């Protein structure tokens, strides 16, 4: 007991910068392992029958020590919530067109939680932010907004990707970046290469509005027989969805034409090399 | 023709060759109804362009099942040949289809079972999707995986299903049997037709299942799928079959000739040879070497064309692509059995190699400046240029190339003379970044992210390949080669396995992706391949360089070369030692007295175990001091210099006292007695006339003189105060040798490791050495088996410090002019990995050899200014001794002091008695007798009582 | 041996059918006249002579120790309502263990059918089943509710949380729990210790296979479309049931023992419902001729029995019993459907419409079954009783200090296991020799075998004396020599997957004096012996390798590739038979269940018949076409079919036909 009514008097929470030059608590199994030592270490001296030189000095910091338990692992929650969907919401764009109102209710719990990181970074001493009122409850008030905040993204994003179903096959990051860079159509064809089997690219228009055919790994280009325009349809699982049905329609009619062209090389027993060339050239290797 | 029509070239052949086959096969069977079922077997197709939806206008048909075509864009991939396997695997799968079943497929693995379910599902232009179940499985993702095959009608594939481990195993079963009992409602007797889709429950909700989806669980099965899937057993393929429309396909006249040899000879390959970890002559090797073929069949015709005209020999290129691929990763004693294998399946024809002329005239002007030997063929350094070649040729296809061989060959300088031939070639500079694995921890490697801030922070290999990729600096111009030197093991090669492959890109744990330039070469220089996981060895290419590729005489040339050229001051010292190069120039030859010597050490006993480049390096250390002692002996008489009569007298006799310690310093004394003896009956050089005596017992002075050792042994007289004190070694027989061994083994500051019997007296040897010498200050380090680099870094930490950059990073004692030594207490102690790498060992092999190593703060190379290792150790055998790794070893020579002798524990203990009885002078007759006692007494203790009854019976001089 | 030189009846009562009811007097006793006596000395004199009846005389020896109705309650049906009436608490669960392929939940039915009780039948494997189940057990004790789990073994973490809680006493005495599961080594322990154990198994016989599927088949799904349908399903049933009843002589049957449950015979129900509804339309009398035979046989061949086939061989059995039966032919009224059945008895198809004639048929086929009713030679129930009985003598010796013991026989082991093996012979003109580097190979890594078994044994003597201290892999070797259990160690080259070690360190003798054979030749002669070595193939380390080496000799000795090389065989007599130029001698080779006179294959019914000198030709392929006089026997290494070494061409006789060997299963054996 000794050492508890000391380790207190002298303990920093070692503040680190965030990459929004923001303050955060860093240490955390000092803050645990100790705290549950000393609350355990006074458990048992009020337990054990030797105790008759602290009559009363640990009950007044056993309810200190649990203050402490519970402010800091509902603290370390909301930080870890509070960073994940930081970056959530700052790295991915159109993220404040899409789900609006997400944007704005993150960006006042972002302001009252920097507040509050200022607060404790004013007097960064445990002892110190314990005597501040309003801690506790404003911060499950923190945790419930960003486990609802959370759960909402995440409804979100199963709504999306119910609506073409090939998003299913990429994380959640990655549908996120899908998404979010919807100006930046230049990004999305890193991820094609998962969502089918062999498009790689959509080779857009000049000014990258209107999706002119598709691609593959060694080269081949499939022009659509319909362009798609992005700019009628703004949604990104719209057109995509139109993407694919296009390229089914184009493949379909390649096709027939195909198996017109072919059906004069078949019937003929003379065949001249330049037009059956010709013909291999025209046409995709799977047709 | 371009490589995309090539490829519709190559799929058209294979399909025409398959209708071929059916029709050839109707007409024989003489069928003439249009519904008998040997025609309803084959794969039709029909198509009505009428139908206005896209689906369904394109019909499949194998059997029964009716198919509609998933218009999906296949892109190019590849197409399998349908052998009657793939015929009966197609049927097989259709009707499991049919039935609203799964397909399983069970075989060996290399059958081709994964690809044949991928090629049924692209046949019908389903989005197949492939699992590999061995490893790199991520299970939290078949949650939404499989709810995207459900609402996409995709199907699935499973790659060695039953190599999942149980807990895993389980719960995809139970996914997998939820959707199979989903999908068998598709086909209901009374609910056929279904107006509200059948549902299945995979992320705790309710989905709907297309019926196009299939799902196949190929083996090498869980009581859950057993009534629901299909098996068919793709036990063996038609290698044959595959080889002649592979071979038809790329243009080779008689391929069926060649097909039904080259599978033969790919049948014998797994049988006269020995059998290696990297050997693969499977079906998938077989396809690399028929597409090279034929890349090669074409470059002929198209050379012969600048100079249709088919008349080239067909099987003198499908030998050619053979021995352009096999023979690099077959070691020395394979190769003349391959050659006698194609003798037999190929008789009369033979194998030419390319001259690469203009590459074999650079290698000989990087070497011969490099004081390396180079040859051309049957001669010295044939073997070597050609393994550069080889791997030049590896470089030239692949970009994961992984030199293996046993520690002792030319791995690190073939490398290096590469790099330098084709900087000189091509005009293209060369940087090599030699990362260590091993000695920085995985996270030290890559980079890692703090779960507090997820700030990302890279490791040396992120940083190096960002470095490259960002910042140009010469960045297509300049051939950077991360050579990772060290051994090869799968915690650190799971990231680079998608590096490896064809995707050439790093995927970090924070998620963003590196893509490898076109002209990074990713290397590792390995030892051998005991701890490699199947998929880094397949991913590349590999040159073996055997043991036998260099030979002793190239040793002996690059010495000799290095030698005369090489001033061991860093102009008189160069003519001394040229002079001595010519003295021991007809030892240094082939046969002789050094390779007679070396070849009959071979055959003795030693406590580590041997290596020639070890007992190669220490004779050359101490031939180095034998023309210092030279330069010393003429500086202190300027007048009347040693001249070349008296030059050779004293190196003869050193060239034999040098062998005698260097062959026989880690073995017993009757071993070093039985190389003497042989020793005698085979050297020209006058050795001791006295044949009672062994050579070991004598010194070669300056004179070129046979002075016995115990000439130099005085007799000394400790004070009272200072008997049996800490630090105080009594003069004997083996303090004058084993000091003047550890003296002439320090003035190269080279790293060496005293290994003997635990109290024989290693720690009181060294420290008798080095504090003598003014500038050796000793550093004292432990090594246990928790010691881990970071001990290292501490004491570099605590005793050194880092310049700022004078040329680069460079560790330097605190003080100047003084020299570290960190002695290794049991250097061999460190507990030995679970994947056969002691860290630390291989973490001061890094700086014994490269002279340096990398920091982890900033990712920069850091050398060496001033510090020297020395070691000491128990013998291996002793329980808890690990024995050193060779590539370490060969580094460190040894010296075995084992326990004094009888008499020389007497001339040692005596002493101590006649100072301790000067307290008593009426007792000094008696001093002779207690020790000649006490010494007896201990010899009759040690005698018996060994290890073997108790493990705690030590008797040593310490008692 | 002077007691059997007399008694000219020994040689009839070795030749009896059931030489155990009368068995002559052997012992040498005159006082003992006990029965127990005669009953042991005559299982002894049965362990000597005629090892197939075994099983007869243990039975009889039970008989004469405890009764003539002692196992006699085992044969009755069990009638599980008294056991669960009066001794099963409500506590104990009662485990209905069934073999794969068989339920048992038809018991319990017709259980609950005679007590008039109400079982709350629950399926397991759902999620919501584990659930409902607990809810079942929840509402049931408290009202003593049957609950009958179907399947339970699926699930073992919940099969463990349900023993564990059933510890709870419960209300009711009525209360009694029927967990279903199958024979699966997954099940927790603890619930079959603390519940009572019930095996079924399905009786053997193609007769009750019959039954059991004709069962399983609805009937509605039998009668309609067509009638030639019923002939059909008819022929499936014979099929399948035959296809499950060679299953059981493994060895001499199908070599793997392949899972054909009930999946199998569903997948062909529905094939041929199919096609017989695409075939036929209507419902008209389609005539035999009509019948889509060859897609019903490739089918069936290929995609649903022939997807579990693992060897080319039982792939070639599989086509030959389709094709002999799945014909037109078959719907005459003459054709067999096992010829020289009983000697030469047959099996005629019921002339029938309706499944009530065909199931009339099946119920009154014979009690009687040889096992030529599957074309197996009738020696296979020899075979199989042998093998049962060493399997029993084996199950009780594991049923029973031991340094003294294990010392002696392990200085017996080193006595006779030769003494190590030389390879003193590399010459560079036999390098070229394919068959030289063959056996250098060969010596080379048996030698080091030999110096490993050698160290371990020698080891193992000087613990056992005391002056060693054994270490974890001797202590291990220990724990596998002290149970008969082959050391991994000790295994370099294929062996029977269970083996003595005895029988392992003889047959190592035995290759090791081989081996010294061949380095004595090659020490005298570098290339003349070693061609003229009659080398015994079962002995070979890699005998395939051997096959390998001579025909690399055969193509280096001439100028022909290896690729133009078949093998062509000729069995001789006298053993001093001279060798041509190609010609290879071996020896050991074993013919089952045929016998060759000159080079022409005979059937006979004694199997293991010896092959002396059997010389291997390499001769120059024409590539032509075999003759239909000729078959493809399979030349395995062990006694069990696992591996193949090659294939061998035989000439047969002029009146077998090469179906009914590849349907008695005909093989050559090296051991
Ligand atoms: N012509 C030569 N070719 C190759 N090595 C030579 C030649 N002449 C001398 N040597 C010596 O051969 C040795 C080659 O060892 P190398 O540097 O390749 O080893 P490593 O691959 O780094 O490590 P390890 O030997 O443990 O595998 C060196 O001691 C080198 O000086
Ligand atoms: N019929 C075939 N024709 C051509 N190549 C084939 C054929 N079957 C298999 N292969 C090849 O066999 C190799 C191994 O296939 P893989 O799917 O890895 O086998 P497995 O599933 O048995 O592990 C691949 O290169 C594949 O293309
Ligand atoms: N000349 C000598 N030769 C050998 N041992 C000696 C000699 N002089 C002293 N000793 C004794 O040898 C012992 C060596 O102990 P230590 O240095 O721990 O041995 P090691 O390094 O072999 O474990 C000490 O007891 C030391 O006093």
Same mark, same amino acid.
């Given at each position: ?12 929470? &070692?503040?680190? *910068?965030? $990459?929004?030059?923001? +303050? ?5 199994? @000092? #803050?645990?392992? !100790? ?92 002892? &110190?932010?314990? *005597?501040? $009122?309003?801690?506790? +409850? ?5 945790? @419930? #907004?960003?486990? !609802? ?139 | ?959 | ?671």
């Amino acid at each position: 007991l000794k050492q508890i009514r000391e380790v207190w008097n002298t303990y920093e929470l &070692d503040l680190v *910068n965030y $990459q929004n030059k923001c +303050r955060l608590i860093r240490g955390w199994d @000092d #803050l645990f392992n !100790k705290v549950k030592e000393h609350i355990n270490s006074v458990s048992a001296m009020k337990l054990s029958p030797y105790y008759k030189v602290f009559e009363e000095d640990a009950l007044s910091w056993e309810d200190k020590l649990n203050r402490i338990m519970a402010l800091f692992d509902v603290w370390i929650d909301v930080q870890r919530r509070w960073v994940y969907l930081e970056g959530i919401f700052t790295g991915s764009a159109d993220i404040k067109h899409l789900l609006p109102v997400e944007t704005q209710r993150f960006q006042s719990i972002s302001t009252e939680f920097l507040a509050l990181m200022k607060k404790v970074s004013k007097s960064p001493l445990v002892m &110190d932010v314990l *005597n501040i $009122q309003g801690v506790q +409850r404003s911060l499950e008030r923190l945790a @419930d #907004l960003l486990g !609802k905040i959370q759960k909402a993204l995440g409804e979100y994003l199963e709504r999306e990707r119910s609506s073409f179903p090939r998003f299913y096959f990429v994380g959640d990051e990655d549908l996120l970046e899908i998404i979010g860079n919807s100006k930046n159509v230049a990004k999305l064809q890193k991820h094609f290469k998962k969502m089918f089997a062999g498009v790689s690219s959509i080779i857009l228009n000049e000014d990258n509005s209107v999706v002119l055919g598709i691609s593959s790994r060694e080269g081949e280009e499939v022009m659509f027989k319909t362009p798609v325009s992005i700019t009628e349809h703004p949604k990104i699982n719209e057109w995509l969805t139109l993407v694919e049905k296009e390229m089914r329609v184009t493949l379909a009619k390649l096709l027939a034409e195909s198996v017109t062209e072919v059906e004069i090389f078949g019937k003929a027993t003379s065949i001249d090399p330049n037009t059956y060339i010709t013909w291999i050239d025209k046409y995709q290797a799977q047709l | 023709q371009p490589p995309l029509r090539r490829r519709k070239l190559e799929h058209l052949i294979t399909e025409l060759v398959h209708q071929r086959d059916v029709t050839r096969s109707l007409i024989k069977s003489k069928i003439d109804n249009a519904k008998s079922f040997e025609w309803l077997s084959q794969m039709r197709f029909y198509f009505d362009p009428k139908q206005t939806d896209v689906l369904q206008q394109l019909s499949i048909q194998m059997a029964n099942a009716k198919f509609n075509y998933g218009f999906e864009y296949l892109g190019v991939q590849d197409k399998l040949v349908q052998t009657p396997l793939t015929d009966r695997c197609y049927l097989t799968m259709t009707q499991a289809l049919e039935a609203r079943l799964g397909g399983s497929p069970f075989g060996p693995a290399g059958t081709g079972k994964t690809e044949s379910v991928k090629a049924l599902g692209h046949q019908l232009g389903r989005f197949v999707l492939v699992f590999n179940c061995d490893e790199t499985f991520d299970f939290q993702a078949m949650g939404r995986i499989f709810v995207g095959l459900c609402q996409v009608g995709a199907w699935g594939c499973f790659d060695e299903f039953n190599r999942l481990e149980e807990r895993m195993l389980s719960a995809v079963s139970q996914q997998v049997q939820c959707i199979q009992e989903a999908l068998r409602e598709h086909s209901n007797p009374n609910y056929d037709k279904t107006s509200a889709p059948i549902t299945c429950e995979l992320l705790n909700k309710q989905v709907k299942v297309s019926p196009d989806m299939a799902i196949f669980i190929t083996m090498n099965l869980p009581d859950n799928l057993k009534k629901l899937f299909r098996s068919l057993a793709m036990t063996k393929p038609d290698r044959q079959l595959i080889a002649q429309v592979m071979l038809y396909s790329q243009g080779f006249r008689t391929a069926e000739v060649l097909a039904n040899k080259i599978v033969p000879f790919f049948k014998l390959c797994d049988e006269q040879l020995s059998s290696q970890s990297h050997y693969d002559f499977g079906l998938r090797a077989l396809k690399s070497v028929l597409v090279s073929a034929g890349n090669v069949k074409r470059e002929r015709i198209q050379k012969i064309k600048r100079e249709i005209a088919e008349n080239l020999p067909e099987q003198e290129i499908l030998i050619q692509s053979v021995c352009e691929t096999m023979v690099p990763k077959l070691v020395a004693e394979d190769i003349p059995l391959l050659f006698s294998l194609l003798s037999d399946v190929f008789p009369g024809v033979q194998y030419h190699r390319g001259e690469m002329t203009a590459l074999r005239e650079e290698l000989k002007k990087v070497c011969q400046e490099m004081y390396l030997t180079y040859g051309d063929g049957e001669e010295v350094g044939g073997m070597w240029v050609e393994k550069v070649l080889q791997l030049y040729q590896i470089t030239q296809i692949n970009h994961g190339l992984m030199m293996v061989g046993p520690s002792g060959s030319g791995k690190s300088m073939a490398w290096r003379v590469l790099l330098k031939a084709l900087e000189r070639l091509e005009g293209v500079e060369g940087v090599a970044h030699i990362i260590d694995p091993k000695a920085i921890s995985k996270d030290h490697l890559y980079g890692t992210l703090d779960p507090n801030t997820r700030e990302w922070t890279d490791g040396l290999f992120t940083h190096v390949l960002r470095k490259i990729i960002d910042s140009v600096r010469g960045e297509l111009q300049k051939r950077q080669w991360i050579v990772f030197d060290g051994d090869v093991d799968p915690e650190w090669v799971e990231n680079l396995n998608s590096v490896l492959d064809d995707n050439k890109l790093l995927t970090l744990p924070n998620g963003e992706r590196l893509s490898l330039p076109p002209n990074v070469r990713i290397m590792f220089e390995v030892q051998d391949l005991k701890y490699a996981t199947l998929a880094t060895v397949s991913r590349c290419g590999m040159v073996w360089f055997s043991e036998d590729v260099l030979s002793t005489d190239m040793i002996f040339n690059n010495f000799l070369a290095r030698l005369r050229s090489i001033p061991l001051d860093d102009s008189p010292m160069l003519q001394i030692q040229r002079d001595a190069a010519t003295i021991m120039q007809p030892y240094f030859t082939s046969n002789g007295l050094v390779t007679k010597a070396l070849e009959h050490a071979f055959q003795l006993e030693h406590i580590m175990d041997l290596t020639r480049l070890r007992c190669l390096g220490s004779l050359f250390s101490m031939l180095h001091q034998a023309c210092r002692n030279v330069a010393q002996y003429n500086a202190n008489h300027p007048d009347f210099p040693m001249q070349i009569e008296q030059l050779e007298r004293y190196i003869q006799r050193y060239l034999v006292y040098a062998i005698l310690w260097s062959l026989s310093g880690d073995s017993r004394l009757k071993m070093r007695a039985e190389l003497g003896e042989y020793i005698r009956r085979i050297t020209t050089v006058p050795l001791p006339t006295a044949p009672n005596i062994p050579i070991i017992d004598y010194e070669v002075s300056i004179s070129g003189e046979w002075s016995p050792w115990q000439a130099k042994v005085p007799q000394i007289e400790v004070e009272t105060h200072k008997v049996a004190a800490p630090d105080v070694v009594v003069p004997t027989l083996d303090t004058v040798r084993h000091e003047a061994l550890l003296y002439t083994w320090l003035a190269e500051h080279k790293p060496l490791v005293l290994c003997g019997p635990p109290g024989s007296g290693k720690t009181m040897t060294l420290f008798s050495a080095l504090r003598a010498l003014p500038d050796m200050e000793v550093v004292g380090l432990n090594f246990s088996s928790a010691t881990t680099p970071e001990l290292l870094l501490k004491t570099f930490d605590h005793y050194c410090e880092y310049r700022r950059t004078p040329n680069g990073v460079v560790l330097a004692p605190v003080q100047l002019g003084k020299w570290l030594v960190l002695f290794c207490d049991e250097i061999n102690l460190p507990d030995m990995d679970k994947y056969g790498t002691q860290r630390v060992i291989s973490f001061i092999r890094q700086m014994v050899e490269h002279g340096g190593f990398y920091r982890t703060s900033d990712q920069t190379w850091v050398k060496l200014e001033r510090i020297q290792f020395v070691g000491a150790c128990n013998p291996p055998t002793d329980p808890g001794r690990k024995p050193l790794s060779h590539r370490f070893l060969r580094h460190v020579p040894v010296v075995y002091v084992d326990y004094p002798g009888p008499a020389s524990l007497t001339q040692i203990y005596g002493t101590f008695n006649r100072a301790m009885l000067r307290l008593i002078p009426s007792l000094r007759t008696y001093a002779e007798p207690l020790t000649a006692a006490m010494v007896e007494f201990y010899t009759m203790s040690q005698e018996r009582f060994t290890q073997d009854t108790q493990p705690h019976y030590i008797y040593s001089p310490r008692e | 041996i002077a007691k059997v030189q007399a008694d000219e009846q020994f040689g009839i009562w070795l030749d009896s059918s059931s030489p155990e009811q009368t068995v002559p007097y052997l012992w040498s006793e005159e006082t003992p006249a006990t029965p127990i006596g005669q009953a042991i000395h005559r299982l002894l004199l049965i362990q000597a002579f005629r090892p197939d009846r075994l099983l007869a005389m243990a039975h009889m020896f039970v008989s004469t120790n405890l009764g003539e109705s002692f196992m006699s309650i085992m044969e009755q049906p069990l009638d599980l309502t008294h056991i669960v009436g009066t001794e099963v608490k409500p506590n104990t669960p009662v485990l209905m263990c069934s073999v794969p392929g068989y339920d048992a939940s038809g018991h319990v039915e017709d259980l609950a059918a005679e007590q008039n009780t109400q079982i709350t039948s629950i399926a397991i494997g759902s999620a919501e089943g584990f659930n409902q189940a607990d809810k079942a057990i929840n509402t049931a004790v408290k009202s003593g509710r049957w609950v009958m789990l179907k399947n339970v073994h699926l699930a073992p973490g919940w099969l463990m949380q349900l023993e564990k809680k059933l510890h709870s006493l419960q209300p009711h005495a009525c209360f009694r729990l029927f967990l279903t599961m199958e024979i699966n080594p997954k099940v927790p322990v603890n619930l079959l210790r603390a519940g009572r154990i019930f095996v079924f198994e399905p009786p053997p016989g193609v007769k009750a296979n019959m039954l059991r599927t004709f069962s399983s088949i609805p009937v509605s799904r039998i009668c309609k479309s067509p009638n030639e349908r019923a002939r059909l399903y008819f022929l499936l049933a014979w099929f399948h049931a035959i296809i499950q009843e060679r299953l059981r002589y493994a060895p001499l049957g199908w070599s793997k023992k392949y899972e054909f449950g009930e999946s199998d015979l569903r997948s062909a129900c529905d094939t041929v419902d199919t096609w017989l509804d695409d075939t036929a339309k209507g419902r008209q009398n389609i005539s035999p001729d009509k019948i889509p035979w060859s897609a019903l046989k490739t089918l069936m061949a290929q995609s649903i029995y022939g997807g579990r086939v693992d060897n080319e061989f039982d792939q070639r059995l599989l086509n030959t019993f389709l094709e002999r039966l799945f014909t037109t032919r078959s719907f005459d009224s003459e054709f067999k459907l096992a010829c020289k059945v009983d000697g030469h008895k047959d099996i005629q198809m019921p002339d029938g419409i309706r499944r009530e004639e065909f199931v009339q048929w099946v119920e009154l086929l014979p009690d009687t079954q040889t096992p030529s009713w599957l074309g197996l030679p009738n020696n296979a129930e020899r075979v199989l009783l042998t093998t049962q009985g060493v399997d029993m003598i084996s199950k009780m010796l594991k049923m029973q200090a031991w340094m003294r013991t294990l010392h002696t026989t392990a200085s017996n082991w080193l006595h006779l296991i030769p003494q190590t093996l030389s390879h003193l012979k590399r010459t560079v003109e036999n390098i070229k020799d394919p068959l030289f580097r063959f056996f250098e190979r060969e010596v080379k890594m048996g030698a080091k075998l030999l110096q490993d078994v050698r160290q371990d044994l020698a080891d193992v003597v000087q613990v056992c004396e005391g002056k060693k201290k054994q270490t974890n892999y001797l202590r291990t070797l220990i724990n596998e020599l002290v149970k008969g259990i082959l050391p991994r160690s000790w295994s370099h080259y294929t062996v029977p997957a269970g083996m003595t070690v005895i029988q392992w360190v003889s047959d190592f003798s035995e290759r090791i004096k081989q081996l010294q054979n061949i380095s004595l030749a090659a020490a005298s002669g570098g290339a003349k012996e070693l061609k003229n070595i009659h080398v015994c193939l079962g002995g070979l380390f890699v005998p395939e390798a051997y096959i390998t080496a001579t025909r690399q000799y055969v193509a280096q000795a001439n100028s022909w590739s290896l690729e133009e090389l078949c093998l062509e065989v000729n069995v001789t007599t006298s053993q001093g038979a001279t060798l041509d130029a190609c010609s290879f001698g071996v020896t050991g080779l074993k013919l089952q269940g045929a016998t060759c006179n000159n080079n022409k294959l005979s059937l006979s019914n004694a199997i293991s018949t010896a092959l002396p000198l059997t010389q291997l030709r390499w001769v120059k392929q024409t590539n032509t076409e075999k003759k239909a006089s000729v078959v493809t026997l399979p030349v395995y290494l062990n006694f069990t079919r696992a591996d193949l070494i090659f294939t061998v061409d035989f000439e047969i006789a002029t009146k077998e036909d090469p179906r009914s060997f590849y349907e008695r299963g005909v093989a050559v054996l090296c051991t």
